[PDB]
């Protein structure tokens, strides 16, 4: 992801907890 | 939460509250 799928929406904290491992 | 629209920076903060310790991805 990175960019796209946050900045320009909404990631979940799911996908944050894709993104710190 | 409302879990916001995070461009640069501010996606890095709420991995910073989701991480702690590990660091985030890499």
Same mark, same amino acid.
Not at chain 1, 14 to 20: A, R, V
Not at chain 2, 3 to 13: D, F, M, P, T
């Given at each position: 992801?990175?960019?796209? @799928?946050?900045?320009?929406?909404?990631?979940? =904290?799911? @996908? =944050?907890? &894709?993104?710190? &491992? | +939460?409302? &879990? @916001? !629209? =995070? *461009?640069?920076? !501010?996606?890095?903060?709420? =991995?910073?509250?989701? *991480?702690?310790?590990?660091? +985030? +991805?890499?």
């Amino acid at each position: 992801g990175i960019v796209e @799928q946050c900045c320009t929406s909404i990631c979940s =904290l799911y @996908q =944050l907890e &894709n993104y710190c &491992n | +939460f409302v &879990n @916001q !629209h =995070l *461009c640069g920076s !501010h996606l890095v903060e709420a =991995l910073y509250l989701v *991480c702690g310790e590990r660091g +985030f +991805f890499x």
